[PDB]
Design a protein around this ligand. Structure first.
Ligand code: CA
Length: 172
């Protein structure tokens, strides 16, 4: 987690990950960057919000989608990513969706550092998440590093608040 933060996404275009015999030799590979806030308050609806981008190093173009996901006990919005900036490709009528996208940063852009940790609200990353999101709890989440970063706030089987962040590298 030394690299965190990568404030400019375009940097990623020039960083290579794990490749194998299966990997094409033509292919520079693709980055699959996903950040997701999940918030499930007690025995009501869960709403999960995030975004997925796809950074094809060959074309050096990036599209993906902002997803909103309510689920009892999924709407995607198509974005592209030019010049370290996420922009919507299908029209959005909603204003609150048009804005979260505009003010959206991936955790790798702002985050600053299996594995098992109990954090304080003095921690930097917990403060980053609280400021940026509307988190319905006061307690200091755990950190779960399996790349997969998770901050889990509340796990009770009747309510579940958590944040996950991944960066992955695949063939295109
Ligand atoms: Ca930390």
């Amino acid at each position: 987690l030394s690299m965190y933060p990568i404030k400019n996404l375009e940097d990623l275009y020039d960083k290579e990950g794990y490749r194998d015999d299966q990997f094409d030799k033509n292919d520079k590979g693709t980055w699959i960057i996903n950040s997701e806030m999940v918030i499930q308050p007690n025995n009501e609806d869960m709403v999960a919000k995030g975004m997925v981008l796809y950074m094809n190093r060959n074309t050096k173009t990036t599209n993906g989608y902002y997803y909103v996901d309510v689920t009892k006990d999924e709407k995607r919005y198509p974005v592209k990513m030019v010049d370290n900036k996420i922009i919507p490709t299908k029209e959005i009528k909603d204003e609150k969706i048009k804005k979260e996208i505009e003010n959206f940063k991936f955790f790798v852009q702002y985050g600053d550092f299996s594995a098992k940790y109990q954090l304080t609200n003095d921690d930097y990353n917990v403060k980053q998440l609280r400021k940026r999101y509307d988190i319905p709890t006061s307690k200091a989440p755990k950190l779960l590093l399996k790349k997969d970063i998770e901050f889990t706030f509340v796990e009770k089987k009747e309510e579940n608040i958590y944040f996950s962040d991944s960066l992955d590298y695949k063939k295109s």
